[PDB]
Each structure stands twice: as C-alpha cells, then as structure tokens.
Amino acid sequence: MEMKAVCVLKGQGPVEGTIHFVQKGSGPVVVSGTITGLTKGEHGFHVHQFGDNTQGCTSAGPHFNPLSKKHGGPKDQERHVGDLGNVTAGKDGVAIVSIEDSLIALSGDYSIIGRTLVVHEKRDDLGKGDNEESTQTGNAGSRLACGVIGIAQ
Amino acid sequence: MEMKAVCVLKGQGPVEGTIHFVQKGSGPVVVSGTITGLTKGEHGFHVHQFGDNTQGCTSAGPHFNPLSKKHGGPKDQERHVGDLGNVTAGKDGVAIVSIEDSLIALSGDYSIIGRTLVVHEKRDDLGKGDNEESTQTGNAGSRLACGVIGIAQ
Ligand SMILES: [Cu+2]
Ligand SMILES: [Cu+2]
Ligand SMILES: [Zn+2]
Ligand SMILES: [Zn+2]
C-alpha cells in the first residue's frame, strides 16, 4: 500500500535528528529529515541489525546484512542492505538527508522496521578502503547517535 | 523459530527501564524486565500503535488495536491487542514485569516490532470504569515513559 516509518536519533554527545521513511508498494524507500550537532563534512549512515538501545548505539550490532555481503556504498551491487552511504553537514552542523534506496524496505525480509539507524563520526569510504575494516564498516568510526526505526501514521 | 525484542523506556521524569520479549513460533509472547522510578502501586502498561517518538510519548498515538475493539484487561475477550493491563511498583518504586500474552506477537499482523511500549501514571481500570474513556485508555492517564520495540539478538 503506502508504508511510513520514523527514527529519532540520540547519543552521548550533541548529535540528534529525525528521519522519515516512505515506501509506495514495492517501490523505493524515500529517506528524508535533518540531523543537527555534526562536525563539518561527511558522516557514515547505516541501518544496523538490532533495535537494541540497552548499551547505547553499541548494542545495535553490525550493519543489517541478511545476504552476508561485504560493506559498500548504496550504489554498489556488493553492499549490506543497511548501507545508505554518507550524509553531509556544513559549518552549522546540520545535515539534510535525501536518499532513495531499493534494497532497504519497510516490510518483508529486507524490513528495517525495529532495526537501528546510526550516524557515524567519520566519512564512509563505501567499502573502497584497503583493509578488513572497510569491508565491514567503511572505516566510518564511532556511532554518534542512533534510534529504533518505528512504524509511523 | 524463537523471536526476541527489547524496549528501553524513557520519558521526561525519573521513570526508566528495559523490557525483554520472547516468542517461540506462533506461541505466547513472554514480557520480562524491571521499571524503576515509579510511584507505589499499579501502572497501565500498553503497546501503542506508532513507533513515533518525535513528540515524546504522545506521538505513539492510541492503543494498538488492529481488530477495532474497546479497551480491556489482558484476560478480557473485548480488548486492544496492545492492552497488557497493569505493572506493580513496591515502596522502592521498582516494578518487576512478568506477563504472558496471546494477542501480541513479534511477527505477522499482530507484530509489536516498531511499535511503542508505554507505562502510565495511573492504574488501568481494565475498561470497567463506566465512562467512555475507560473503553479507550482505562483512565490510565499520562505517559511517564516509552520506547520503540526493537528486534534483539
Ligand atoms: Cu553504521
Ligand atoms: Cu498506554
Ligand atoms: Zn555496511
Ligand atoms: Zn487499550
């Protein structure tokens, strides 16, 4: 039909945001919203496996990866389902999120409902880095803020 | 086979806590955990429709009610799917949560994954209060804490 989701991001520092998700039937998922309190530049942005905030962002576990692939950018065939690339903040610390993705979903096997959205300290190298870390996390560094993706009206 | 979920309760007051959920296939959902910071006595405990924390606990919307029934206690035939009745806090303000429910699920149309768990200021009257409000909320009153229900390991 039309599915909607929302995620409120919070962490140990000043990073916070609200992210919206809409999927018309089997179409792409449109991701939108704003994140504040970021350092100027690119920040890694992924859906992680577990909607578990019991030990902050660390209990979210790894990138959502039901097809057991290596980390990539959203545009790569080799990617985690959860790989949404980078969001960009300017001098004011504000990122405007605008992403269309056909691998994440708001129902079925690839559903991100009840999973965690995380925004990272550093840029996601999109799996192009020459180490194991790139093939797992895109060398995106620490988890600044996260939240559980919920069903929205 | 065995599905697990977890919920971290937060609000504006001192009311915190972690609720765990386990379901084996199409069996009962077992709810367990502790809630701290509560006033002595019974507090309404429900699953609300929306995993939306944009306006704190109030964006969760009403009781998860896919069968379009009136409010009730968990033991009642005429109830909301979300209606998990009352938790009990001692002198110390700690409620030990232990519930077995047959209407909630962690998959399918009755799934609470991506929905919001809410603990209330007042006792839930199980839809017996004889005002219309009883048939909606059991006059459980305001929402002290909530969290989005997430997929756990
Ligand atoms: Cu991540
Ligand atoms: Cu409630
Ligand atoms: Zn990844
Ligand atoms: Zn109800």
Which alpha helices (H) appear in chain B, and where do they start and end? 134-137
- B117 CA to centre of own chain: 4
* A8, A50, A54 member nearest B53 (Cβ): A8
Look-up of token digits 């229900």? B149
Provide, as residue numbers in chain A, all residues whose Cβ is less than 8 Å from the Cβ of B116.
150
| A43 marked among binding-site residues | no
Q: Distance between CA B124 and CA B82 in Å, rounded?
A: 13
In the residue annotation, B120 being an active-site residue is answered as yes
Q: Which CATH class is domain A2-151?
A: mainly beta
DSSP-derived 3-state class of residue B82? coil
Chain A residues with CB-CB distance to B under 8 A? 5-6, 8, 18, 49-54, 61, 113-116, 147-153
Resolution (A): 1.6
* Marked catalytic residue, from A43, A52, A79, A80: A80
Q: Which ligand sits closest to the CA of A115? A: 1
Which tokens hold the place of B132? 């219309």
Cβ separation B116–A150 shorter than 8 A: yes
Task: List the domain boundaries for chain B.
Answer: 2-151
Provide, as residue numbers in chain A, all residues whose Cβ is less than 8 Å from the Cβ of B114.
5, 51, 113-114, 148-151
In the residue annotation, A43 being an active-site residue is answered as no
Which tokens hold the place of A29? 């998922």
Cα A38 to Cα A10, A15, A54, A127, distances in angstroms: 12, 6, 23, 22
Where in B1-104 does DSSP place strands (E)? 2-9, 16-24, 29-36, 41-48, 83-89, 95-101
Cβ separation A149–B114 shorter than 8 A: yes
**What is the per-residue burial (b if ≥16 Cβ within 10 Å, else e) of A87-101?**
bebeeeeebebebeb
Q: Which residues contact B77 (CB under 8 A, 6 or more apart)?
A: none
Cβ atoms of A95 and A42 within 8 Å: the answer is no
Q: Experimental method for this entry?
A: X-ray
